[PDB]
Ligand binder design. Structure first.
Ligand SMILES: [Ca+2]
Ligand SMILES: [Ca+2]
Ligand SMILES: [Ca+2]
Ligand SMILES: [Mg+2]
Length: 182
């Protein structure tokens, strides 16, 4: 009905590979957090707010910052944020479901996961001392960029630091992103 190939990049993707999948309050809290002016629509300039704040907190290379901005753009375009029309609240749930199928389809096809590309682009920006890994204080900066209490990094670092090494490796940050989105 509402979202389709002409409307939504995850539908465009599914149909380009022949996958016929059709869509039949914690989730809505998420939309309403992204909808910065509370008008009932998510637009791309609103989603680019988050990497723009992250970039102020650290001193990543222009290349890293652009890899992050572009990965956030791609991610949210596939999450249903269209360049002109953006994404309506009425469409949020179905945009999330079709996106989850598109991520499954990518993985079957051996194609890169968009959540993984997002997470890796943050990882390079978060590792602000260049030692190779993200520590808990670097994770706080992430919480600060996302407007979440910095102390919540203790909780998240713990859940994510699955090899108990005291540092997040790339795959662990991917795990934390993924648990978060789907
Ligand atoms: Ca809005
Ligand atoms: Ca580091
Ligand atoms: Ca670890
Ligand atoms: Mg606006």
């Amino acid at each position: 009905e509402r979202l389709n190939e002409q409307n939504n990049e995850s539908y465009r993707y599914l149909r380009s590979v022949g996958n016929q999948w059709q869509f039949n309050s914690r989730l809505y809290k998420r939309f309403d957090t992204f909808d910065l002016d509370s008008d009932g629509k998510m637009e791309m300039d609103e989603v680019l707010y988050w990497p723009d704040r992250m970039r102020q907190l650290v001193n990543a290379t222009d290349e890293q910052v652009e890899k992050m901005r572009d990965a956030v753009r791609v991610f949210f375009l596939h999450k249903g944020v269209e360049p002109v029309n953006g994404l309506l609240r009425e469409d949020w749930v179905e945009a999330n479901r079709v996106f989850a199928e598109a991520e499954r389809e990518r993985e079957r096809r051996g194609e890169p996961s968009l959540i993984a590309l997002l997470s890796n682009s943050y990882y390079d920006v978060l590792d602000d001392d260049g030692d190779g890994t993200v520590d808990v204080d670097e994770l706080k900066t992430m919480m600060k960029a996302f407007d979440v209490p910095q102390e919540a990094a203790y909780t998240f670092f713990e859940k994510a630091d699955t090899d108990k090494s005291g540092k997040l490796e790339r795959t662990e940050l991917v795990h934390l992103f993924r648990k978060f989105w789907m």
